[PDB]
Symmetry: C6
Subunit: 101 residues, 6 copies
């Protein structure tokens, strides 16, 4: 359940820049982006605890510097419980895509 790092934000252009940062600032895998509605959107990454940290870190600074960047919330569980992974979009995609479509 390698640490999970996510960061919410108001606006899409700022969420992309946050995602580009996290994935660059550390050895973290961008797992997905979640839309809660009301201009709110989270970006989730996975990797070690200090990896997931270093990236959630940068991500936030880069997001805010955006022409409208508004980091709404931020969090990271180090060793997030497993059951959690089969209920939330903290995991991988692409795979069962052929079946969905």
């Amino acid at each position: 359940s390698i640490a999970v790092g996510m960061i919410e934000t108001r606006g899409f252009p700022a969420v992309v820049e946050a995602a580009d940062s996290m994935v660059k600032a550390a050895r973290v895998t961008l797992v997905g982006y979640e839309k809660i509605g009301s201009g709110r959107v989270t970006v989730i990454v996975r990797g070690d605890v200090s990896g997931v940290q270093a990236s959630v870190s940068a991500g936030i600074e880069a997001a805010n510097r955006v022409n409208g960047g508004e980091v709404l919330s931020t969090h990271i569980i180090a060793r997030p419980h497993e059951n959690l992974e089969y209920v939330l979009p903290i995991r991988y995609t692409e795979e069962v895509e052929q079946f969905r479509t």
Copy 2:
């Protein structure tokens, strides 16, 4: 119809942390997360009444401590009526997934 515990929240990062808590603080199964729109999202678990309690409890404290955590609503029916289970997302998933896709 083992007790049902859910907790709403504004923002996704705070709903995940709420879910990670509930599922850890007790013997409860995270059944799913519901999106009502407008930054609002609920997390639902299942287990005994005191199990579902102990977890909805912790969940709320952990959510609020989040960098933007905003617990919107909270509830738990101890012995929630059956018909209710076949109309609301209080149950299990994964199973008929192959057919949907």
Copy 3:
């Protein structure tokens, strides 16, 4: 066109408790739950006029007592017009489910 009873609410956990009430407080069948967007969600039941009443009644008290329960709107047509039933989600589901999927 047996009377129709519904109750809107802000938040999902409060809408479930409202539904658990109505369906218990009287001989009413929970037909479905509607999402209008913006944290708003209605619960609809069917039964006699006094049955659909007694339940929409309880439902409201139980919803409000919820940790965030916010009953938004409430209504009941006693003998609601038929055409209405084939345009709104006031009816039954499950049946043409195999075809949809």
Copy 4:
């Protein structure tokens, strides 16, 4: 292109009551209900100009009397242009339903 009558409203319970009225107050056919998002929902009927009137009239009074009824907008084109009918949900449904599903 028999006149078209519709009425928007905040909340679902109030839109249903609006629909139950229009379809009763006149010889109008409830064609459908549209969701624009943000608690907003329209109800559309069809019939003569004075029929579509008499019903959009009542509809509004009945909606407002609802425990949360909030008529947002209201309109009626008497002889609404045809092209319009093949781009907006002002028409009939049910028919190509078997193919969709």
Copy 5:
């Protein structure tokens, strides 16, 4: 890429009246209506520059006269770039409908 004329509006009944106008006031084809969420909805038409003008014109006056008409935004590109047409809903529908369904 014959000029494109669109007009946003708060509420559905006002967007329909806007659409009924544009399509009548000129030789323009109502291509579609877009929902951005939050009671906001645009209506798009196509035709010459002066045709698409004359209609976006009327449309706005007719929309505002509606019992709740609220024209939110308005625009028209005369010779809108092609790539744009294969990314936005400025074009025609109906055609690949059988496949979608």
Copy 6:
């Protein structure tokens, strides 16, 4: 991962004009438009860094001049990480469209 340029905006008519600009002001390919909810919508283009710049530039001026144009956010990654491309809508569409439908 040729530079990515996007610009958010409140309202749809202003997002279209922004897109019409970017795609004209430079050698950039409009990849798509994203809806975050709450009247917010982004437009994304791809091309060189200075190409993607020159266009995100114009786009913003043209959007603001719109009858309701409200540029919400703005950004551009020059060499945006690859993983990012398989999680966000920064890429191409049309292709697997036949399968989706």
